[PDB]
């Protein structure tokens, strides 16, 4: 089921299936900001990643000596959430553990995804409450896909991303869906990086983030199009688009979790970059997105 939150600036449609944004449109220009999930390329819009971000080696892990099987980015995106609260400019989806999640993930939890509007700014906020009698181990992340508009002669290579603060950051390369740890290197994120079909030939660009002032701007100097993602305290951000079958979108993925390292031992308790949450406690994270059309955000 789809649900709408909206104001005078932007209108957002979100599904209770995976608590996933389906659509973000300018109230002024009717421009669509979200990738529309063409199944020929990538049949999702903006998945929620939980209780892991990225892939486990062999899609498996052990916990307390027992082996579990869990696919890339966990189960949230295939789960149906309850609508806990819904007002004009806010909606909160809730997912609890059930018989099925417990089979692949031996924890009890309350996972809430809240979306709310402030002008042309949309928050995507995560809340995880551990309901288990032991410390819960999880990753959580966003994965919004944004259109690159090409209705007025623009091309993907006219677009770029720019990270603020403008500092060089460590990139963690991916090899066979695991972190190619020993090839981490400082990357030229102190200035813009242009998009292209070939850019993502070696999978997602993964950057180590520091502090809480990080913002990734997706822009073009052809027009006024501008999507800004404020990653708050995310320790990582992934930038990705499909390859070898390409299309005109890019994902900017704030992550509080990360794929297995090439050398992971598979023990969940040893898994690098996971959050550890004591019984009864709450973890909160999230990020914010602002949208600007190719033209002015004014009444025409």
CA–CA separation, 99 and 106 (whole Å):
10
Domains (range + CATH), the chain: 2-300 (2.70.98.10)
DSSP 177: T
Residue where the block lists tokens 């709450």? 282
Answer for the pair 261, 180: CB distance below 8 angstroms, yes or no. Answer: no
CA–CA separation, 171 and 190 (whole Å):
13
Give Cβ neighbours of residue 171 (< 8 Å, ≥ 6 apart).
184, 185, 186, 187, 189, 205, 206, 207, 208
Answer for the pair 101, 75: CB distance below 8 angstroms, yes or no. Answer: yes
Q: How many CB atoms lie within 10 A of CB 42?
A: 18
Burial class of residue 24 (count of CB atoms within 10 Å of its CB; 0-12, 13-18, 19+): buried
- Cα atoms in the 13 Å half-sphere on the side-chain side of 199: 24
Helix (H, G, I), strand (E, B) or coil at 77: helix
By what technique were these coordinates determined? X-ray
DSSP 200: G
Write the DSSP assignment of 225-277 as a string of letters. Answer: -EEEEEEET-SEEEEE--SSS--SEEEEEEEES-PPBTT--SBGGG-TT-EEE
Answer for the pair 79, 97: CB distance below 8 angstroms, yes or no. Answer: no
Helix (H, G, I), strand (E, B) or coil at 164: strand
Tokens linked to 59: 């899609």
Tokens linked to 239: 């930038």
Give Cβ neighbours of residue 101 (< 8 Å, ≥ 6 apart).
75, 79
Answer for the pair 265, 275: CB distance below 8 angstroms, yes or no. Answer: no
Helix (H, G, I), strand (E, B) or coil at 156: helix
Answer for the pair 167, 146: CB distance below 8 angstroms, yes or no. Answer: no
Tokens linked to 166: 């403008």
- Cis peptide bond prior to 51, omega within 30° of 0: yes
- Cis peptide bond prior to 165, omega within 30° of 0: yes
Taken as a whole, the chain contains a residue count of 300
Expressed in Å, this structure's resolution amounts to 1.9
CA–CA separation, 179 and 56 (whole Å):
10
Residue where the block lists tokens 């999640």? 101
Q: How many CB atoms lie within 10 A of CB 259?
A: 29
Give Cβ neighbours of residue 100 (< 8 Å, ≥ 6 apart).
none
CA–CA separation, 125 and 90 (whole Å):
11
Q: How many CB atoms lie within 10 A of CB 126?
A: 23
Answer for the pair 202, 174: CB distance below 8 angstroms, yes or no. Answer: yes
């Amino acid at each position: 089921m789809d649900y709408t939150i909206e104001n005078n600036m932007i209108k957002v449609v979100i599904s209770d299936h995976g608590a996933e944004i389906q659509s973000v449109k300018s109230a002024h220009t009717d421009e669509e900001f979200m990738w529309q999930a063409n199944p020929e390329i990538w049949g999702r819009h903006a998945p929620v990643l939980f209780p892991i971000v990225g892939r486990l080696k062999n899609d498996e892990y052990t916990y307390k000596g027992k082996t579990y099987h869990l696919g890339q980015h966990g189960f949230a995106r295939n789960a149906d959430f309850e609508v806990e609260n819904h007002t004009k400019e806010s909606i909160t989806f809730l997912l609890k553990d059930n018989e099925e999640t417990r089979k692949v993930y031996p924890f009890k939890f309350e996972f809430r995804v809240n979306y709310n509007l402030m002008n042309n700014l949309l928050e995507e906020n995560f809340s995880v409450v551990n309901k288990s009698d032991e410390t819960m181990i999880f990753g959580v992340g966003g994965h919004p896909g944004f259109n690159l508009p090409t209705d007025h002669g623009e091309n993907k290579e006219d677009f770029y991303f720019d990270m603020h603060p403008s500092v060089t950051r460590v990139r963690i390369p991916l090899k066979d869906a695991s972190l190619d740890w020993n090839n981490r290197s400082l990357a030229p994120t102190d200035s813009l990086i242009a998009l292209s079909d070939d850019l993502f030939k070696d999978d997602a660009l993964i950057y180590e983030l520091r502090g809480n002032d990080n913002k990734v701007s997706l822009r073009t100097d052809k027009n006024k199009f501008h999507v800004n993602v404020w990653t708050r305290d995310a320790p990582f951000v992934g930038i990705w688009s499909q390859y070898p079958k390409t299309d005109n979108y890019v994902c900017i993925e704030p992550w509080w979790g990360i794929a297995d390292r090439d050398d992971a031992d598979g023990d969940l308790e040893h898994k690098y970059g996971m959050n550890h949450l004591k019984p009864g406690k709450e973890f909160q994270a999230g990020f914010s997105m602002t949208y600007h059309s190719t033209t002015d955000e004014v009444k025409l």
